[PDB]
Design a protein around this ligand. Structure first.
Ligand code: BCL
Ligand code: BCL
Ligand code: BCL
Ligand code: BCL
Ligand code: BCL
Ligand SMILES: CC[C@H]1c2cc3[nH]c4c(c3C)C(=O)[C@H](C(=O)OC)c4c3nc(cc4[nH]c(cc(n2)[C@@H]1C)c(C(C)=O)c4C)[C@@H](C)[C@@H]3CCC(=O)OC/C=C(\C)CCC[C@H](C)CCC[C@H](C)CCCC(C)C
Ligand SMILES: CC[C@H]1c2cc3[nH]c4c(c3C)C(=O)[C@H](C(=O)OC)c4c3nc(cc4[nH]c(cc(n2)[C@@H]1C)c(C(C)=O)c4C)[C@@H](C)[C@@H]3CCC(=O)OC/C=C(\C)CCC[C@H](C)CCC[C@H](C)CCCC(C)C
Ligand SMILES: COC1=C(OC)C(=O)C(C/C=C(\C)CC/C=C(\C)CC/C=C(\C)CC/C=C(\C)CC/C=C(\C)CC/C=C(\C)CC/C=C(\C)CCC=C(C)C)=C(C)C1=O
Ligand SMILES: COC(C)(C)C/C=C/C(C)=C/C=C/C(C)=C/C=C/C(C)=C/C=C/C=C(C)/C=C/C=C(C)/C=C/C=C(C)/C=C/CC(C)(C)OC
Ligand SMILES: COC(C)(C)C/C=C/C(C)=C/C=C/C(C)=C/C=C/C(C)=C/C=C\C=C(C)\C=C\C=C(C)\C=C\C=C(C)\C=C\CC(C)(C)OC
Ligand SMILES: [Ba+2]
Ligand SMILES: [Ba+2]
Ligand SMILES: [Ba+2]
Ligand SMILES: [Ba+2]
Ligand SMILES: [Ba+2]
Ligand SMILES: [Ba+2]
Ligand SMILES: [Ba+2]
Ligand SMILES: [Ba+2]
Ligand SMILES: [Ba+2]
Ligand SMILES: [Fe+3]
Lengths: 60, 258, 280, 318, 40, 60, 60, 40, 60, 40, 60, 40, 60
C-alpha cells in the first residue's frame, strides 16, 4: 500500500493549531539566527560599502 | 636541603576536608527532603505490584516524632500514607500525561482545587484556645486606627457581580492579623470563609475584590462544621476551592494564549 | 515519577503557549512549550561552550587551548566590532552562547509561570527570578550597549569572569566606594542575616529540647522580642527576605550600570559632592 | 490581579503581648509596648517589651563603651570640630596599634584606644551570644541561632583577633571606619596576591550568593503559598498542607527535585552558616599559610592564560 | 486530539498547500539572492 | 498546489486580539533590532552630518 | 536498536509522543551545532571570498 | 504507554520508513557534499 | 568467554524501559563527548586541511 | 518488574541482537578510522 | 582462610536491584574519572603525533 | 530483602560470573594496555 | 576493666549509642587532623625523596 496516503493522520497525534504556532516560532528564531550567521562571515551585506563607502562618505 | 617545596600545602588539604564535609552535608539534606512525599509514585511500583518502592539516592531517614503541645498527638516523618483516589482521568494512558478533572472543575477537588486531609481539629494559641477565630469570638481584637473596617464591605467576584458582603473578620490570636474574611453570601445568606490571600481591597469604594472565583462560586465554598472556630482540615478545603478558580473559574484560564 | 501526594494536582492546561502540544511531564520535570524551547537554547548553548573549550583561543593544538575546568573561557569580541555580529572564532561564539543563555533563562522563567498557573500558586518565584535575569542582562546586554559595543560583556569562564570583574572594578580605582555598590553589598549581607535568623528560628521551634513539645507562634515572637525588642513576625520575615534578596540583585544591577555609562571618573571621587557642600 | 502579601492592607490590634512566661531566674521584662502603624504596614506592629538580664545589661554596657571610644576618637581626629566630624565621618576612623608595637598594649595616643574598643567590642559580642542562648533556653527551644551566631562570631574573631595574634601584629586587625574598613578590605586582598584565587573566599562568595538565592526562592515560594497559610510554617511542618504540597511541587516541576517545609530551612540555615564559615577559613589562611593566592592558584594550575597581547619589561631586571 | 480522520485530511490539505507556498516564496528569495550573489 | 484555500478559517483556531498584539510587539522589536543593525554598520546616517560634519565646524 | 522483527514492541515501552518531541528537539539543535562547528573551521563556506571577493565589491 | 500490541504495529511502520526518508535526504546531502568539497 | 550468556533473568531486576532510555541518552552524550575530545587534539580531522588546504586554494 | 517470564526472554532476545547491531556499526567506524588515521 | 562461608544472603540484606545500579553508575563514573586522569599526565595517549604528525606534516 | 531464599541463590549465581565476565574484559584490556603501553 | 567498678553506671547517664558514635566521629576526624599535622612537619614521609626520589625516576 506504500505510504504518503495516511500521513494526514499525523494530526491524531499532534494537535494542528499548536503545531502551527510552534512552527512559526521556530521560523522566526531560525530566521534571525541565520541572518546573524551569514552576517558573521564575509558575505556580509552591511559593512561592505555597497554601493559606496558610507563610513568614509563622511570625512572628505 | 632546606628548600624541598612540598606540593601539598594546608590550603589544598583544607579544601579537601571542605569537599568531604560538603558531600556528607548534601546527602543529609537530601535525606531530610524525603520526610514527606516519599516513596514516589511510578508505574514501576504498580507494574511490580509494589516490589519496587521508589526512593532514589540517598535513602529515607528513620521516622522522627513531633510531639504536639496540648494533648495534640504525635506526628511522624517519614510516615505511611493511605493512597487516595484521583478525581480525574488520564488525558492520555501514556506515562507523564496529566489528568482532566472529573465533573465541574471547581467541585473536582483536583488540580489547583486539590488539597490534603489535615486534622479535623483546631490550631491553638499557646494557652490552647482556637488560634484562628472570628473577632466576634475574639472580643478584644480591633481594626487599626485609620484602616477601613472590612466589616460591611461588599465582596465581589471576578466578573464584577456582588457575591455577598463582609459579615465579620477572622483573626489570629497568636500573631494579631487578618487571616480570613467572612462572607455573608448574597445568593443563599450562608456563611463562608475567604482567605485574605485571595482578597483585594478597594478602600475608597469599601469593596473586597476576588479575581479567584466568580460571584456564583461563593455559593459552593466548603463549609465549617462550627461557626466560631475552624479546623486545619477546613482551612485547606476552604483555600483550595478558591485556588481552583485560578485555572477553572473561566473557560480561559485553561491556557493557551496562542 | 511523582511525590506521594502529587497525582491529585497534575491537571491539564495552564500554558501561555502550546496547549496540549507539549502539555506533559517527563520524570519529575514539567515540560511545556518553554521547556522544549529552553532545552534547545540550553543544549545548544552548553554544546557550544563545549566547542569553545575544544578549540581554545588560538586553536586546538595551542597551549592556550584547554579542557581544564578552571581555565576554559569564551570571551567577547574586541571593542572594534561595536554592536555588530563578530566572526564566530573572534567572540562570535560568545555572542551566540549569550543569546542562548538569555533565551534559556527567559524560557525557564516562563515555564515556572506555566507551572504557577497549573498549581494555582502565586507568581512570586518567576518574578523574583526575573531579577536575576535582569542582572544578567545588564551584565551582557544593557551595559555593553550603552557602551557602543558587546565586547563590554563579561566572558563565560569560571575564573576568567573573575578576572573580568576584577579589572573592570579596578578601572575605577577603589570600587568599594561605589555607593550603589555599598547598598547592594549591604543587602546581600542583610539577606544573609535574615536567612540565618529565620532558618535558626524555624529549626529552633519545630525541634526543641527533648522533653518539650513543638513550639508556637507565641514562642517565635517572644524570642526575637526578648533578644532585640521586636519581631517582624512569620509572614513578614518571608516578605523581608524576599525584599532583601531581590533588592540585593537590584542594587547590584544598578551599581554596575552606573560604572561606565553614567560615571567615568574613579568612584571615591563621587563622594566629593559631600565634602564640598556649603556647610563645610 | 490578586493580593501579593507585601503590604498588610488592613491591620488589627489586641492588647500588646508580654509573651510566653519564663521560669524563675529569668528576670522580669522591662519597657511597655507601642505600635507603629507603618511597621504594621509590613510586619508585627508591636514594638517590644525587651528582656535585660545581667548578661544583656553587661553587654549593652561593654558595647556602648566600645562605640564611645571609636566615636570620641573620630571627633578628636578632626579636632572636636563637630562640623568637620560630620563632614568627614565616612572617612573618619580609629586606626590600630602600629606594627612597631607588635601585640604589646600600646599608648593611648597610638592605638591603645583601638585595643580597648576591640577588647570591649568582642566581650560585648560574645556576651550577646550568651544572651541569645539564655533567651533561647527559657523557651525550651534549641540553640540553632547560637550555633549560627557562633559561626559569625568565628569570622569576626578570625578577622580582628585570631589572625592578628597569629601574625604577631595588632596592626593586621581591621580598623573602625566605614571607608577606612573598606580600604582595609581592599588592601587586604592586594597584600596577599588577589583574594579571588583564594578558594575559600570563592566558596564563601558561593554561599553569600546562595543565601540570596535561597532566601529569594523560599521567600517567594512562601509568599506564593501565603494564600494557603504557608507562612505558618510551623503547622505546615507538623501537619503538611496543600501549602507545603504546592510549595514543594512548584520546585519539583521546575528543577526536578525538592525539599520540604521543614528541610528548606535546613538548606537555608546551613547555607548562611556556610558563608561565615568559609569566609573565616579564608582569612585564617591569609598570611599564615598562603601569601599569594594568585600564585597558589597557579601552583594548582587553576589560573588561566590569555594571549599575551600587552606587556611591560621589568625595570628591576635592567 | 479532538480530530476525526476526515478532519485530518482537510487541515493537512490546507497546511500542505500553505507550507509548499512558503517553501516556494523561499525558493524565489534564494534565487534573487543567488543571482545577485552566488555563494558557491 | 492543492485545492482548498479559504484560509479565513484560521481565525476560528487562533485568538485575534492576542495575534494582534503579538504582531504589533514583534514589529516594534524587529524595528529596533534592524535599526540597531544598520546604524551600527556602514549604511549609518548619524555619524556623518550633511553637508559637513558639524563638530568640525568648530576647531576651537 | 531492536533489529529483530519484534522491533515494533519498542513502542509499548517508549511512548511515541515523548520520544517524538525529544527526537525533534535533539535533531534541530544537533543540526545548528554541527553547522556552526563547521562554519568555525577551514571548511567554512561563507568566509572564503566565493566565487569572487565581495569586500572589494564595496570596500577598499 | 498508550499502544496495543497491534497499534505498536502501526506506529512502527510509518516511523521506520519516515526515519529512513530523513536518512535518505541526509546520505544524499552527504554524497552531494563530498563531490563539491572533499573533507576526508 | 564464548558464552553469549548465563541467565537472561536480568529484566526481572532492571526496568527494560529505564535501561533502554539510559543507554540511549548516555550513548549520544558519550558520542558527542569523545567527538569533541578528538577535535581538540592532534587527532582533529577538520582543521587539518584534508585532503588539500581550503583557505588558500582561493584568493586571499 | 511487572513483566512475565516469557517477555524477559523476549525483551532480552530483541535487545541483545540490537546491542550487537550497535557494536557492529561501532567496530566498523573504528577499524575504518584506524585505517584512515591510526592513533596509537 | 579468607574463604567466605556464605556470600549469598548478601542479597537478602542489600537490595540487588539497587546494588547493580550502584555498580553500574560507579563504574561508568570511575571510568570517566580515570580516563581523564591519565589523559592529564605523561601517560597521555593522543597528543603523541602517531604515526606521523597530522598538523603541518599531514597530507595538505 | 523482598526476595526468596532461592532467588538470591539464583541471583548470586548469575551475578558472580557476570561480574567476572566484566573482570575478564578488564584484565584483558589491561593486558592489551600493558603490552602496547607498559607503565610499571 | 573500669578500673573498678560502678563506672558502668556511666552508661546509665550517657546514651551508649550516642557515646559510641561520638567517639567514632571524634577519632575518625582526629586521625585525619594529626595525619595532616605530620604531613607538614619533620615527620612528613612522602614528599621527602624517601628512600629514593621518584620525580627523579625520569625527569619531571
Ligand atoms: C593509556 C590508556 C589506554 C586505555 C586503556 C584502557 C584500559 C586498561 C581499560 C580501558 C577501558 C575502557 N576504555 Mg580505554 N584506554 C585508552 C583509550 C581510550 C579511548 C580513547 C579516546 O582513545 C576511549 C574512548 C576509551 C574507552 C574505554 C571504555 C570503552 C572502557 C571502560 C568502560 C566502562 O567504564 O565500563 C562501564 C562498566 C560497566 C559495568 C557498564 C556496562 C554497561 C551497562 C549496560 C551500563 C550502561 C548504562 C546502563 C544501561 C544504565 C542502567 C539504567 C539504570 C539502572 C537506571 N579508551 C588508552 C589508550 N581503557 C576498560 C575496558 O576495557 O573495559 C573493561 C579498561 O579496563
Ligand atoms: C574587583 C574590585 C571591586 C568589585 C567589582 C565589582 C564589579 C565590577 C562587579 C561587582 C559585582 C558585585 N559585587 Mg563586587 N567588587 C569588589 C568588592 C566586593 C565585595 C567586598 C566584600 O568587598 C562584595 C561583597 C562585592 C559584592 C558585589 C555584589 C554586590 C555584586 C554582584 C551581584 C550579582 O551579580 O548579582 C546578579 C546575579 C546574576 C547576574 C546571576 C543571574 C542568574 C541567571 C539568570 C541564571 C544563571 C543560570 C546559570 C546557567 C546557572 C548555572 C547552573 C548550571 C546550569 C547547573 N564586591 C571589589 C572592591 N563587584 C557585580 C555587580 O555589580 O553586580 C552585577 C559587578 O559587575
Ligand atoms: C576587595 C578585594 C577582594 C575582596 C576581599 C575580601 C576580603 C579581604 C574579605 C572578603 C570577604 C567576603 N567577600 Mg569579598 N572581596 C572582593 C570581591 C567580592 C565579591 C565580588 C562580586 O566580586 C563578592 C561577592 C565578595 C563577597 C564576600 C563575602 C562572601 C565574604 C564575607 C561576607 C561576610 O559577610 O562576612 C562579614 C560578616 C562578619 C564579619 C560577621 C559580622 C558579625 C559581627 C560580630 C557583627 C558585630 C556587629 C556589631 C557588634 C554591632 C555594633 C557595631 C560596631 C560599630 C562595630 N567579595 C575583592 C576581590 N572579600 C571576607 C572573605 O572572604 O575572607 C576570605 C573578607 O574578610
Ligand atoms: C577520525 C575519526 C572519524 C570518526 C570516528 C568515529 C567512530 C570510530 C565512531 C563514530 C561514530 C559516530 N560518528 Mg564519527 N567520526 C568522525 C567524524 C564525525 C562527524 C563529523 C562532523 O565529521 C560526525 C557528525 C560524526 C558522527 C558520528 C555519529 C553518526 C556516530 C555516533 C553517534 C552516537 O553516539 O550514537 C549514539 C547511539 C544511539 C543513540 C543508538 C542508535 C539509535 C537508535 C537506538 C537506533 C534506532 C533503533 C531502532 C530503529 C528502534 C527505534 C528506536 C527509536 C530510535 C527510539 N563523526 C571522524 C571522521 N565516529 C560512532 C558510530 O558510528 O556509531 C556506530 C563510532 O563508533
Ligand atoms: C607517629 C608520628 C606522629 C603521630 C601520628 C599519628 C597518626 C598518623 C595517628 C595518630 C593517632 C593518635 N595519636 Mg599520634 N602521632 C604522634 C604523636 C603523638 C603523641 C605525642 C605525645 O607526641 C600522642 C599523645 C599521640 C596520640 C595519639 C592518639 C591521640 C591517637 C590514636 C588513639 C587515640 O586517640 O586515643 C588516645 C591514645 C593514647 C592516649 C596513647 C598515646 C599514643 C602513644 C603511646 C603516644 C606516643 C608518644 C608517647 C609519649 C611514647 C613516645 C615514645 C617514647 C618517646 C620512647 N600522638 C607523632 C607526632 N598519631 C591516630 C589517630 O589519631 O586516630 C585514632 C592516627 O591515625
Ligand atoms: C535575584 C535574586 C537572586 C536570584 C533569584 C532567583 N534565581 C533563580 C530563581 C530566583 C527567584 C529561580 O526561580 C530560578 C530557579 O530555578 O531556582 C534555582 C533561578 C536560578 N538561579 C540560578 C542561578 C543563579 N542565580 C543567582 C543569583 C540570583 N538569583 C540572586 C542572588 C546566581 C549568582 C551568579 O549568584 C546564579 C548562578 C539557576 C540555577 C536558576 C535558573 C537556571 C535556569 O534558568 O536554567 C536554564 C538555563 C540553563 C539550564 C543553562 C543554559 C545554557 C546556556 C546557553 C549556557 C550558559 C552560558 C553562561 C552565560 C556562561 C556563564 C559561565 C560561568 C562559568 C560564568
Ligand atoms: C551566617 C552569619 C550571618 C550572621 C548571623 C548572625 N548575626 C547575629 C546573630 C546571628 C546568628 C545573632 O544571634 C545576633 C543577633 O542578635 O541577631 C539579631 C547577631 C548580630 N549581628 C549583628 C550585626 C551584624 N551581623 C553581621 C553578619 C552576619 N551575621 C552574617 C551575615 C553583620 C555584617 C557583617 O554585616 C553585622 C553588622 C548584630 C545586630 C548582632 C550582634 C549585636 C551585638 O553583639 O551587640 C553587642 C553590643 C552592642 C551593639 C551594644 C548595644 C548598643 C545599643 C543599640 C544601644 C542602646 C542604648 C540603650 C537605649 C540604653 C541606654 C544606654 C545606657 C548606657 C545609658
Ligand atoms: C518564623 O518567623 C520569623 C519571625 O516571625 C515570628 C520573626 O519575627 C523573626 C525576627 C526578624 C526580624 C527582627 C527582622 C530583622 C531584620 C533586619 C535586622 C534587617 C535590617 C533592615 C533595616 C535596618 C532596614 C533597611 C531598609 C530600609 C531602611 C528601606 C530603604 C529603602 C530604599 C533603599 C529604597 C527602596 C527601593 C528599592 C530598594 C528599589 C527596588 C526594590 C525592589 C523592586 C524590591 C521588591 C520587594 C518586594 C518585597 C516585592 C524571624 C527571624 C523569623 O524567622
Ligand atoms: C530474576 O532473577 C533472579 C533469581 C534475581 C536472578 C537473576 C539474576 C541476575 C540476572 C543477576 C545479574 C547480575 C549481573 C549482570 C551482574 C554484573 C555485575 C558487574 C558488572 C559487576 C561489576 C563489579 C565491579 C566492581 C566490584 C568494581 C569496583 C571498583 C572499585 C570499587 C574501584 C575503586 C577505584 C579507586 C579507588 C581508584 C582510584 C584511582 C584514582 C586515581 C582514580 O583515584 C582518584
Ligand atoms: C561624638 O560621638 C559620641 C556619641 C561619643 C559617640 C559616637 C560614636 C560613634 C558614632 C562611633 C562610630 C563608630 C563606627 C561607625 C564604627 C565602625 C566600625 C567598623 C565598620 C568596623 C569594621 C570592622 C571591624 C572589626 C572586624 C574589628 C575587629 C576587632 C577585633 C576583633 C578586636 C579584638 C580585640 C580583642 C578581643 C582584645 C583583646 C585585648 C587583650 C585581652 C588581648 O589584651 C591583652
Ligand atoms: Ba568650602
Ligand atoms: Ba555611515
Ligand atoms: Ba554640531
Ligand atoms: Ba561583502
Ligand atoms: Ba590540545
Ligand atoms: Ba575555504
Ligand atoms: Ba604522551
Ligand atoms: Ba590533524
Ligand atoms: Ba615521579
Ligand atoms: Fe520560612
Amino acid at each position: 500500500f506504500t505510504m504518503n496516503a495516511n500521513l494526514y493522520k499525523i494530526w491524531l497525534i499532534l494537535d494542528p493549531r499548536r503545531v502551527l504556532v510552534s512552527i512559526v516560532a521556530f521560523q522566526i528564531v531560525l530566521g534571525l539566527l541565520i541572518h546573524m550567521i551569514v552576517l558573521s562571515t564575509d558575505l556580509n551585506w552591511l559593512d561592505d560599502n555597497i554601493p559606496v563607502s558610507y563610513q568614509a562618505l563622511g570625512k572628505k | 636541603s632546606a628548600g624541598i617545596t612540598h606540593y601539598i600545602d594546608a590550603a589544598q588539604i583544607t579544601i579537601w576536608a571542605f569537599w568531604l564535609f560538603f558531600f556528607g552535608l548534601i546527602i543529609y539534606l537530601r535525606r531530610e527532603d524525603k520526610r514527606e512525599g516519599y516513596p514516589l509514585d511510578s508505574d514501576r511500583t504498580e507494574r511490580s505490584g509494589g516490589r519496587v518502592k521508589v526512593v532514589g539516592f540517598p535513602d529515607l531517614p528513620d521516622p522522627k516524632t513531633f510531639v504536639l503541645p496540648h494533648n495534640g498527638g504525635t506526628v511522624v516523618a517519614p510516615r505511611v500514607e493511605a493512597p487516595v483516589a484521583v478525581n480525574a482521568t488520564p488525558f492520555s494512558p501514556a506515562p507523564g500525561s496529566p489528568l482532566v478533572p472529573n465533573g465541574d472543575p471547581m467541585l473536582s477537588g483536583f488540580g489547583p482545587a486539590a488539597s490534603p486531609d489535615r486534622p479535623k481539629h483546631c490550631d491553638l494559641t499557646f494557652e490552647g484556645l482556637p488560634k484562628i477565630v472570628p473577632m466576634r469570638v475574639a472580643k478584644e481584637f480591633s481594626i487599626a486606627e485609620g484602616d477601613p473596617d472590612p466589616r460591611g464591605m461588599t465582596v465581589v467576584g471576578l466578573d464584577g457581580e456582588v457575591a455577598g458582603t463582609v459579615s465579620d473578620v477572622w483573626v489570629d490570636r497568636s500573631e494579631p492579623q487578618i487571616r480570613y474574611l467572612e462572607v455573608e453570601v448574597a445568593a443563599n445568606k450562608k456563611k463562608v470563609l475567604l482567605p485574605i490571600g485571595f482578597s483585594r481591597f478597594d478602600k475608597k469604594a469599601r469593596k473586597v475584590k476576588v479575581d479567584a472565583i466568580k460571584a456564583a462560586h461563593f455559593a459552593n465554598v466548603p463549609t465549617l462544621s462550627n461557626p466560631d472556630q475552624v479546623t486545619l482540615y477546613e482551612e485547606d478545603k476552604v483555600c483550595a476551592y478558591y485556588a481552583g478558580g485560578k485555572l477553572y473559574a473561566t473557560a480561559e484560564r485553561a491556557g493557551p494564549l496562542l | 515519577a511523582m511525590l506521594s501526594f502529587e497525582k491529585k494536582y497534575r491537571v491539564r492546561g495552564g500554558t501561555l503557549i502550546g496547549g496540549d502540544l507539549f502539555d506533559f511531564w517527563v520524570g519529575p520535570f514539567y515540560v511545556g512549550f518553554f521547556g522544549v524551547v529552553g532545552f534547545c537554547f540550553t543544549l545548544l548553548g552548553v554544546l557550544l561552550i563545549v566547542w569553545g573549550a575544544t578549540i581554545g583561543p588560538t586553536g586546538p593544538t595551542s597551549d592556550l587551548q584547554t579542557y581544564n575546568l578552571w581555565r576554559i573561557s569564551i570571551a567577547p569580541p574586541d571593542l572594534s566590532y561595536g554592536l555588530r555580529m563578530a566572526p564566530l572564532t573572534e567572540g562570535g561564539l560568545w555572542q551566540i552562547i549569550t543569546i542562548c543563555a538569555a533565551g534559556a533563562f527567559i524560557s525557564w522563567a516562563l515555564r515556572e509561570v506555566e507551572i504557577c498557573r497549573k498549581l494555582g500558586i502565586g507568581f512570586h518565584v518567576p518574578f523574583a527570578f526575573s531579577f536575576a535575569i535582569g542582572a544578567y542582562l545588564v551584565l551582557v546586554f544593557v551595559r555593553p550597549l550603552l557602551m557602543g559595543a558587546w565586547g563590554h560583556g563579561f566572558p563565560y569562564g569560571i575564573l576568567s569572569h573573575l578576572d573580568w570583574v576584577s579589572n573592570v572594578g579596578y578601572q575605577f580605582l577603589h570600587f568599594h566606594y561605589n555607593p550603589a555598590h555599598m547598598l547592594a553589598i549591604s543587602f546581600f549581607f542583610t539577606n544573609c542575616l535574615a536567612l540565618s535568623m529565620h532558618g535558626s528560628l524555624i529549626l529552633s521551634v519545630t525541634n526543641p529540647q527533648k522533653g518539650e513539645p513543638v513550639k508556637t507562634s507565641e514562642h517565635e515572637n517572644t524570642f526575637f522580642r526578648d533578644i532585640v525588642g521586636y519581631s517582624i513576625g512569620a509572614l513578614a520575615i518571608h516578605r523581608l527576605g524576599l525584599f532583601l534578596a531581590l533588592s540585593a540583585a537590584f542594587w547590584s544591577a544598578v551599581c554596575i550600570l552606573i560604572s561606565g555609562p553614567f560615571w567615568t571618573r574613579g568612584w571615591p571621587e563621587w563622594w566629593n559632592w559631600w565634602l564640598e557642600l556649603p556647610l563645610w | 490581579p490578586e493580593y501579593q502579601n507585601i503590604f498588610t492592607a488592613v491591620q488589627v490590634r489586641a492588647p500588646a503581648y508580654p509573651g510566653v512566661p519564663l521560669p524563675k531566674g529569668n528576670l522580669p521584662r522591662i519597657g511597655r509596648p507601642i505600635f507603629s502603624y507603618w511597621l504594621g504596614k509590613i510586619g508585627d506592629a508591636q514594638i517590644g517589651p525587651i528582656y535585660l538580664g545581667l548578661t544583656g545589661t553587661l553587654s549593652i554596657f561593654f558595647g556602648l563603651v566600645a562605640i564611645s571610644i571609636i566615636g570620641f576618637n573620630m571627633l578628636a581626629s578632626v579636632h572636636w570640630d563637630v562640623f568637620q566630624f560630620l563632614k568627614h565621618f565616612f572617612w573618619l576612623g580609629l586606626e590600630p596599634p602600629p606594627p612597631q608595637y607588635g601585640l604589646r598594649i600600646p599608648p593611648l595616643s597610638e592605638g591603645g584606644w583601638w585595643l580597648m574598643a576591640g577588647l570591649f567590642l568582642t566581650l560585648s559580642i560574645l556576651l550577646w551570644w550568651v544572651r541569645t542562648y539564655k533567651r533561647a533556653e527559657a523557651l525550651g527551644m534549641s540553640q540553632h541561632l547560637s550555633w549560627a551566631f557562633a559561626a559569625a562570631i568565628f569570622f569576626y574573631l578570625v578577622l580582628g583577633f585570631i589572625r592578628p595574634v597569629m601574625m604577631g601584629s595588632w596592626a593586621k586587625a581591621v580598623p573602625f571606619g566605614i571607608f577606612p574598613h573598606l580600604d582595609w578590605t581592599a588592601a587586604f586582598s592586594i597584600r596577599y596576591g588577589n583574594l579571588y584565587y583564594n578558594p575559600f573566599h570563592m566558596l564563601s562568595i558561593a554561599f553569600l550568593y546562595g543565601s540570596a538565592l535561597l532566601f529569594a526562592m523560599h521567600g517567594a515560594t512562601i509568599l506564593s503559598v501565603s494564600r494557603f497559610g504557608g507562612d505558618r510554617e510551623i503547622d505546615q511542618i507538623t501537619h503538611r498542607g496543600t501549602a507545603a504540597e504546592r510549595a514543594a511541587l512548584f520546585w519539583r516541576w521546575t528543577m526536578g527535585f525538592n525539599v520540604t517545609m521543614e528541610s528548606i530551612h535546613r538548606w537555608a540555615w546551613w547555607c548562611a552558616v556556610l558563608t561565615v564559615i568559609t569566609a573565616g577559613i579564608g582569612i585564617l589562611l591569609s598570611g599564615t599559610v598562603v601569601d599569594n593566592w594568585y600564585l597558589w592558584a597557579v601552583k594548582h594550575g587553576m589560573a588561566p592564560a590569555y594571549p599575551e597581547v600587552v606587556t611591560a619589561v621589568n625595570p628591576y631586571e635592567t | 486530539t479532538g480530530l476525526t480522520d476526515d478532519e485530518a485530511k482537510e487541515f493537512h490539505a490546507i497546511f500542505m498547500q500553505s507550507m509548499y507556498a512558503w517553501f516556494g516564496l523561499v525558493v524565489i528569495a534564494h534565487l534573487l539572492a543567488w543571482l545577485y550573489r552566488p555563494w558557491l
